[PDB]
Design a binder for these strands. Structure first.
Ligand SMILES: [Mg+2]
Ligand SMILES: [Mg+2]
Ligand SMILES: [Mg+2]
Ligand SMILES: [Mg+2]
Ligand SMILES: [Mg+2]
Ligand SMILES: [Mg+2]
Ligand SMILES: [Mg+2]
Ligand SMILES: [Mg+2]
Ligand SMILES: [Mg+2]
Ligand SMILES: [Mg+2]
Ligand SMILES: [Mg+2]
Ligand SMILES: [Mg+2]
Ligand SMILES: [Mg+2]
Ligand SMILES: [Mg+2]
Ligand SMILES: [Mg+2]
Ligand SMILES: [Mg+2]
Ligand SMILES: [Mg+2]
Ligand SMILES: [Mg+2]
Ligand SMILES: [Mg+2]
Ligand SMILES: [Mg+2]
Ligand SMILES: [Mg+2]
Ligand SMILES: [Mg+2]
Ligand SMILES: [Mg+2]
Ligand SMILES: [Mg+2]
Ligand SMILES: [Mg+2]
Ligand SMILES: [Mg+2]
Ligand SMILES: [Mg+2]
Ligand SMILES: [Mg+2]
Ligand SMILES: [Mg+2]
Ligand SMILES: [Mg+2]
Ligand SMILES: [Mg+2]
Ligand SMILES: [Mg+2]
Ligand SMILES: [Mg+2]
Ligand SMILES: [Mg+2]
Ligand SMILES: [Mg+2]
Ligand SMILES: [Mg+2]
Ligand SMILES: [Mg+2]
Ligand SMILES: [Mg+2]
Ligand SMILES: [Mg+2]
Ligand SMILES: [Mg+2]
Ligand SMILES: [Mg+2]
Ligand SMILES: [Mg+2]
Ligand SMILES: [Mg+2]
Ligand SMILES: [Mg+2]
Ligand SMILES: [Mg+2]
Ligand SMILES: [Mg+2]
Ligand SMILES: [Mg+2]
Ligand SMILES: [Mg+2]
Ligand SMILES: [Mg+2]
Ligand SMILES: [Mg+2]
Ligand SMILES: [Mg+2]
Ligand SMILES: [Mg+2]
Ligand SMILES: [Mg+2]
Ligand SMILES: [Mg+2]
Ligand SMILES: [Mg+2]
Ligand SMILES: [Mg+2]
Ligand SMILES: [Mg+2]
Ligand SMILES: [Mg+2]
Ligand SMILES: [Mg+2]
Ligand SMILES: [Mg+2]
Ligand SMILES: [Mg+2]
Ligand SMILES: [Mg+2]
Lengths: 142, 150, 129
RNA sequence: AUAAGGGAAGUCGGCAAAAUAGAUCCGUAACUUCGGGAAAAGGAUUGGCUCUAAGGGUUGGGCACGUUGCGGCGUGCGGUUAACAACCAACUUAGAACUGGUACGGACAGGGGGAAUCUGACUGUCUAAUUAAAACAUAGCAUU
RNA sequence: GCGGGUAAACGGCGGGAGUAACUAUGACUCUCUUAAGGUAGCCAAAUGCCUCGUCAUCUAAUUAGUGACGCGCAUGAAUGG
RNA sequence: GUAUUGGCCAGCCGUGGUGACAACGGGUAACGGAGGGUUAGGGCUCGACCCCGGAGAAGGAGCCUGAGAAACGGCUACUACA
RNA sequence: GGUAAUUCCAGCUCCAAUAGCGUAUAUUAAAGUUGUUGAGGUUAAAAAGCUCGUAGUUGAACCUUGGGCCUAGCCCGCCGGUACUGGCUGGGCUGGGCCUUUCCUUCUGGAGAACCGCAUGCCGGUGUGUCGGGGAACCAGGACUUUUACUCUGAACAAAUUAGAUCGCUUAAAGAAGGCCUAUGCUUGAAUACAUUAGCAUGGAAUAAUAGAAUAGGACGUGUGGUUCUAUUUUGUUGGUUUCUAGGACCGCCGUAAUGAUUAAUAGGGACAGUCGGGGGCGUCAGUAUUCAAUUGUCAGAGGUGAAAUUCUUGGAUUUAUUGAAGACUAACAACUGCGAAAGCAUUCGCCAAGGAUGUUUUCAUUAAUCAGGAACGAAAGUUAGGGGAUCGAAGACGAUCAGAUACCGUCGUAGUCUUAACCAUAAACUAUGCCGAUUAGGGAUCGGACGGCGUUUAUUUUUGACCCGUUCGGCACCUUACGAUAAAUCAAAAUGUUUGGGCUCCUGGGGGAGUAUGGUCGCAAGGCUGAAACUUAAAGAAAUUG
RNA sequence: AAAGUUAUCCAAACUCGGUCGUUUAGAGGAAGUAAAAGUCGUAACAAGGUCUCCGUAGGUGAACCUGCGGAGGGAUCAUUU
């Protein structure tokens, strides 16, 4: 309540709606385009990279485990990020300098589960596909 | 309520339903007008000419008695004041407050009153200017305005 | 200050009827108000009404007989073509069978159903059902 | 006084010398006690000859009668020349064409500049005959 | 002589031991000591012996210059910072 | 001067023009439109792409012929590649 | 998931869609979590400290209504009949003509009707015509007519697309095709509506704006004079001149006419009368108290605390009485009481200007409401220069307590606390509740003004003042109740809201980072105003219930 | 009527300086967030053992303490001649 209601006040309503519409966070991040600037992906869905080392990260307090993530250096723009490796026993397959392919967790830039500070997951290694290699549908080329 | 206040009073006067003179008035419109013109030349403004005639002798409503308005009579007889009486009194009051203020430098309350009075003068002058009683180039300049009143 | 004497009249009628009174008093009276009352009367929603004539503006005293649910006013007078007039009846009427929306047109102010019969449009001023 | 190429490699140290310099027009940073810094930094033009334009002063304005020997007057009474005519007079500023061994503040006269630190606020004063400074004084502040 | 006041009066304004799930340091604690134990600030500065202190910058190369660090032989508040 | 009007240009003379009803400037991962996606109604978002209009042929400028070109499967010059 | 795992690794069995199913990113619904329709602002995120005021938005009522006849079209019922006809003295509904004081502009030309008679011819009507009295309607041309917004109907506007009609491509997504006996043939379709902003015409005349007669500079007349310009054909032709006539502009005299001004808003401004208040400014008067000083009497303790000490004392402390000086402050009366825009305002009296409410058969006549930027005031503390400096007392120095005590307790004590001339502009600046306007329920108190009344009291006494009863206007508040509202506490507004629109301005969108960094702007400074992002998290938070 | 030539115009390209925009190295200084069985105290929630909070100013290892003026979101809706 308290809006202008006259028949010639369309400008005030349009200006107020445009100004107050910035308080939304999804729209504010859309207008400023942080994905184009700050996001590791240049507003894309996937990205290609080079594996540098394998690192283990401890789970949060209620849980207790080592999640066995991995370090990756991006080919597209050369910055270095950390990504997760899922399922079980997959760490053996991915060697050093293996040209991995990455994707998101679906949390849209936020940590998933008890895994701290990891926003990406490995989809392919040596261009074969992790899940297909896991089920022994293919053999990793040397 | 009011332009510069918080009061909500309703004190006023109620005009009777009848628009005809009482049967005991026995005064013609032709005779009555000369008392108005004599008093106007003696110096009384239209504001209290009506109240003095009303209290002293006879006429209660000049409009009902003569069919014409009181100010209109003076204007048609060439006795209308050059400036309206309400603006004249507002100017006089603003001058008197300014005169007190210059002696009393730190009366912040009278300074506040003066801002309201001048803003009311400007608002009323805008109406008179846009209706044509005063010339469009008339301006309220505070320095020599004291001569207009007297 | 007073910006809608029509709104004041309908609000006072609605309050008295909802609280169960039988008579209503309206301080300002106007031609649009009386023309609205005649429309209500022609459909039986009210009874006698009287306009006392003081020289200022006159007053209104309406006689109620129940049977009235609500009567409201739309304050911004929109412009409605004839083709979209059914949007409003879909919007602010409980059902199409009964209820009336009051319009103002070049042929006087009138309800939306015979106004449709007259094949005319104009501006919207209120409603009652 | 002048020197090819290099341009402080000399020396305690750019000591001495060189480079800039007038006027007209553009352009001008950090900082700041908002007064300055500022001629900041950094650019363009400059002769001779033949022309054009602008900037002033002085004297003149209609009828109608009466003295004085066409004139000075005395008057009475109208118009504002859609500003005209003649004469007189020095300098200061702007613009155009042509011209030359591309030169022209042609001699004289005539600021090198920038980024920072230490120290005294400034102008001023003193060891005449080896020391002119950070020394003294100063306005301001405080005490007896 | 005895008893008070006064520092924009002359001037002054400390040492030794332990101590934090590596190492280092010491927020913390005991102890001697008197008029008070250098506060706000500042620094190899015209004030630092060890000293050409250590790190960065400037150079092909710098005991010089500048910016930082501070248990400061022996900085410091109208002896003005 | 141009096919013609026009501060398009050359001379002389005035001091103007736009703006809080948002001028001027900065961003655009911006060719515009017909239109695509999603629905009670109102809307939100996309539109390089078969239809219409505009622009370009590595980056700038200049020009002949011809009714029609500042053309690049036409020419001249510079820069960068080759 | 820490030794019997319905959730991991496997085997059985089962579930969902199915030639398809999962994952990532983007976008819409879900989202009444962007809210014009339609969102919160007492306590959950959020009404600027307060007022004035410009752009901007919004603005009280009032001017031709009704009635009386006639008629056209369109539905419904009924009375029968046969798609279907008269009807019914039917009832509605749309529309078009006249009289009611109103009715409907005007001239020229076209063709020509209706009503009339003239004679000529048939079975009380007609061709009749080369008849005119006469033009219902219509057409073409000229002049006059307040102007916008709004709505109705037209015109003009792309193919594709969207909706949508037709035809069995074997159905369908598509396509614009096809169909008919047997044909050396015939026939059809390839529609239609919407767009919607701007521009062009037509009808309507409510709603919302605008113009007109007040120094008459007003309307009309074949009334009557002027002075200026223009000039069609008629007197053979040409040139010049004049009269009459026709038109335009302008100015007098006279006559004609009902000769021209809406109310006075429980809108607003102003005037007047008796009052009211701790509203503001300057000056002045008084009061005890605290501290200090002088005089006076006596003699051993006085202060302070839960308990002590630091401190002062026969150099007479503390205490008693009298006098003097200085600065600050106005007790009791003092309240569910008053005034001011808020911050705020309390001893007497004099002077100066200002204000609310009431009363009023005064005056003007829409002058109004809220406001982006902009402006005035703005507790306490703080800053810059003078005066003053009693009391308290940041900083500081001591005495106790305590394991420690840079504190809470006690004795001192600087800036400050007061005032004059200038800055600063923030507070839990709180009713945590914006401003204007309308309506809604019972009660009794109370402050100011006015009106009515029976009495008491009292005075150089009456009328006045004090007390009592009842009504009304305007305030600061209170008790009960819920038809109502909310999550609830609670509310006469926080009501009249899913049955959602009286007008205006501002602010908020999970919690942190953060009122931080940076830029700009004001200030002597302290600081004020404006105000992000990276990153991180599944909960923070409100009201109430049992412990 | 070709080469050549004089003076304007349209002007690519290069050099030097100024200005705006984006990215990025840096001794040292000073914050935030998370993970901890770390050290020192106990400020707040009960009258949290000195009622809590707001504006302003000063001080101390740290939470914090003290002065002035406010608020109840309090531990009081209340005391008579
Ligand atoms: Mg107001
Ligand atoms: Mg009122
Ligand atoms: Mg040489
Ligand atoms: Mg040489
Ligand atoms: Mg050189
Ligand atoms: Mg050498
Ligand atoms: Mg050398
Ligand atoms: Mg030299
Ligand atoms: Mg220079
Ligand atoms: Mg300089
Ligand atoms: Mg020359
Ligand atoms: Mg030179
Ligand atoms: Mg000096
Ligand atoms: Mg000497
Ligand atoms: Mg010398
Ligand atoms: Mg000296
Ligand atoms: Mg150790
Ligand atoms: Mg120190
Ligand atoms: Mg040192
Ligand atoms: Mg040195
Ligand atoms: Mg150094
Ligand atoms: Mg060195
Ligand atoms: Mg050197
Ligand atoms: Mg020393
Ligand atoms: Mg010293
Ligand atoms: Mg020293
Ligand atoms: Mg202008
Ligand atoms: Mg582009
Ligand atoms: Mg396109
Ligand atoms: Mg082209
Ligand atoms: Mg080309
Ligand atoms: Mg090609
Ligand atoms: Mg081509
Ligand atoms: Mg098991
Ligand atoms: Mg098991
Ligand atoms: Mg919400
Ligand atoms: Mg809260
Ligand atoms: Mg809150
Ligand atoms: Mg109205
Ligand atoms: Mg189809
Ligand atoms: Mg009134
Ligand atoms: Mg004694
Ligand atoms: Mg005193
Ligand atoms: Mg009182
Ligand atoms: Mg008192
Ligand atoms: Mg404002
Ligand atoms: Mg103050
Ligand atoms: Mg003070
Ligand atoms: Mg001084
Ligand atoms: Mg002072
Ligand atoms: Mg104390
Ligand atoms: Mg004390
Ligand atoms: Mg605030
Ligand atoms: Mg508030
Ligand atoms: Mg408020
Ligand atoms: Mg009485
Ligand atoms: Mg919670
Ligand atoms: Mg709670
Ligand atoms: Mg940096
Ligand atoms: Mg670092
Ligand atoms: Mg506490
Ligand atoms: Mg509580």
């Amino acid at each position: 309540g308290g809006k202008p209601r006259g028949l010639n006040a369309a400008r005030k309503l349009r200006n107020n709606r445009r100004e107050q519409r910035w308080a939304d966070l999804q729209y504010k991040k859309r207008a400023l385009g942080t994905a184009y600037k700050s996001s590791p992906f240049g507003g894309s869905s996937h990205a290609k990279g080079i594996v540098l080392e394998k690192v283990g990260v401890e789970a949060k307090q209620p849980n207790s485990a080592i999640r066995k993530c991995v370090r990756v250096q991006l080919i597209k723009n050369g910055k270095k990020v950390t990504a997760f490796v899922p399922n079980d026993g997959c760490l053996n397959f991915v060697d050093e300098n293996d040209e991995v392919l990455l994707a998101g967790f679906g949390r849209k830039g936020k940590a998933k589960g008890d895994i701290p500070g990891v926003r990406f997951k490995v989809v392919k290694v040596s261009g074969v596909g992790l899940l297909a290699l896991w089920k022994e549908k293919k053999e990793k080329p040397r | 309520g009011r332009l510069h206040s918080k009061g909500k009073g309703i004190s006023a006067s109620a005009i009777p339903y009848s628009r005809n003179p009482p049967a005991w008035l026995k005064t013609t419109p032709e005779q009555v007008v000369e008392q108005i013109c004599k008093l106007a030349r003696k110096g009384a403004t239209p504001s209290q000419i009506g109240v003095i005639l009303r209290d002293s002798h006879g006429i209660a409503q000049v409009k009902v008695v003569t069919g014409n308005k009181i100010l209109r009579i003076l204007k048609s007889n060439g006795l209308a004041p050059d400036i309206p009486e309400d603006l004249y009194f507002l100017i006089k009051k603003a001058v008197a407050v300014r005169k007190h203020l210059e002696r009393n430098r730190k009366d912040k309350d009278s300074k506040f009153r003066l801002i309201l009075i001048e803003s009311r003068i400007h608002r009323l002058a805008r109406y008179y200017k846009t209706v044509g009683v005063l010339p469009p180039t008339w301006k309220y300049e505070s320095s020599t305005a004291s001569t207009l009143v007297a | 200050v007073r910006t809608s004497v029509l709104h004041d009249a309908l609000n006072s009628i609605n309050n008295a009827e909802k609280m169960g009174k039988r008579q209503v008093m309206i301080r300002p009276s106007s031609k649009v108000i009386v023309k609205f009352l005649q429309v209500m009367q022609r459909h039986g929603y009210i009874g006698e009404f009287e306009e006392v004539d003081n020289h200022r503006s006159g007053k209104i005293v309406v006689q109620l007989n129940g049977r009235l649910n609500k009567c409201g006013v739309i304050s911004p007078r929109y412009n409605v073509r004839l083709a979209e007039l059914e949007k409003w009846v879909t919007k602010l009427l409980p059902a199409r069978q009964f209820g009336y929306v009051i319009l103002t047109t070049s042929a006087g102010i009138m309800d939306h159903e015979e106004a449709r019969r007259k094949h005319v449009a104009g501006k919207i001023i209120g409603f009652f059902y």
